[PDB]
């Protein structure tokens, strides 16, 4: 199927700062990936983003009832829906599972990578740090970065490139909003 | 900002596909199944705390369809440029032999929102237990999508996620195997 495609998108966005203390509403219209016209609650009228959206901006701004619907959205739409979903979205907290296992940077070579696997947590903000015998190790740390799993959980792998010596104790430390104190996991050579 | 909630919609020609969903900070709250006219919550628990009248989504999609007709003419029938996906396969937890796990195929940064995705086990299509998300919006107004395959890890099986998209010259296969 080589037939040309044509796409329309609309995004009605509610942006929240400090709960519902400060709220911004965006009514956004798209042709393919190109935003062509938008209502910003900061402005209170539609504005063309590209030339393609000028006829709609002028037409929509001539409709007073429509504009007042859009102008009230921060209250009737954004603050309302926030209230509806707050208990299972804003307040959602799921603890990370933390696993440490050794790995290899190159096949055949001895174990030279320590993986701190942090799984199943929500929300996404997390800080993972490595320690060797009580000292933070900041060199040789590489990560997958923050991975969304698509099911309201995140995961991340944080690896420490190191050559483990007998006796050494490594510690992976995890800080996250769901925790009241750091979560630490030890690994011994 | 602390949080963002987005009601995201699209309508696509000539496929006549239209989607309606709510996004919270990048996760899907729910979408509306247009054929069934039903609200589908991403996590089942959500529907115990909130409701949504699916019929309302239908009205918006009808307007989006009509708006697409208008904008297509206005653009002098300029079609979309295909953007092929990035594909990644990962597990949702550390793999242990014969411990139930889940393979995730993440299909990202693509448009239009049409893709064929197949899970392969030892080169063979598998459909038992698979699941998938709808098309999810990106801040750059491309799309992403997730496919899932529960599996029992073994040394005897290899997996691939196979993705077909009009922006690709050949199907994209991303491999996974134990080790």
């Amino acid at each position: 199927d080589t037939r040309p495609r044509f796409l329309e998108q609309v995004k009605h966005e509610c942006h929240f700062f400090n709960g519902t203390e400060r709220v911004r509403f965006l009514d956004r219209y798209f042709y393919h990936q190109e935003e062509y016209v938008r209502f910003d609650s900061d402005v209170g009228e539609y504005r063309a983003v590209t030339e393609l959206g000028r006829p709609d901006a002028e037409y929509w701004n001539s409709q007073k009832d429509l504009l007042e619907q859009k102008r009230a959205a921060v209250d009737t739409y954004c603050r309302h829906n926030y209230g509806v979903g707050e208990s299972f979205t804003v307040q959602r907290r799921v603890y990370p599972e933390v696993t440490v296992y050794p790995a290899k940077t190159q096949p055949l070579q001895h174990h030279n990578l320590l993986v701190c696997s942090v799984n199943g947590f929500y929300p996404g903000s997390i800080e993972v740090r490595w320690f060797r015998n009580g000292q933070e190790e900041k060199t040789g740390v590489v990560s997958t970065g923050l991975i969304q799993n698509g099911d309201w959980t995140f995961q991340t792998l944080v690896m420490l490139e190191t050559v483990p010596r007998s006796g050494e104790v490594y510690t992976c430390q995890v800080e996250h909003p769901s925790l009241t104190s750091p979560l630490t996991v030890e690994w011994r050579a | 900002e602390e949080h963002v909630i987005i009601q995201a919609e699209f309508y696509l020609n000539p496929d006549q596909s239209g989607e309606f969903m709510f996004d919270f900070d990048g996760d899907e709250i729910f979408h509306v199944d247009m054929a069934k006219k039903e609200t589908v919550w991403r996590l089942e628990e959500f529907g115990r705390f909130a409701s949504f009248e699916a019929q309302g989504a239908l009205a918006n999609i009808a307007v989006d369809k009509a708006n697409l007709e208008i904008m297509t003419k206005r653009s002098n029938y300029t079609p979309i440029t295909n953007v092929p996906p990035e594909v990644t396969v990962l597990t949702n937890s550390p793999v242990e032999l014969r411990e139930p796990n889940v393979l995730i195929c993440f299909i990202d940064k693509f448009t239009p929102p049409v893709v064929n995705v197949t899970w392969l086990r030892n080169g063979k299509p598998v459909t038992t237990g698979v699941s998938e998300t709808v098309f999810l919006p990106r801040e750059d107004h491309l799309f992403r999508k997730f496919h899932y395959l529960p599996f029992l890890p073994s040394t005897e099986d290899v997996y691939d996620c196979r993705v077909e998209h009009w922006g690709l010259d050949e199907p994209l296969l991303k491999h996974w195997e134990f080790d």
């Binding site: 219209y29 006829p55 002028e58 | 409701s51 309302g56 918006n60 208008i70």
Partner: peptide, 13 residues
């Protein structure tokens, strides 16, 4: 309770 939706606006012409 009930999640509300925002209307999509019919375009000109």
């Amino acid at each position: 309770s009930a999640v509300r939706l925002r209307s999509s606006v019919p375009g000109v012409r």
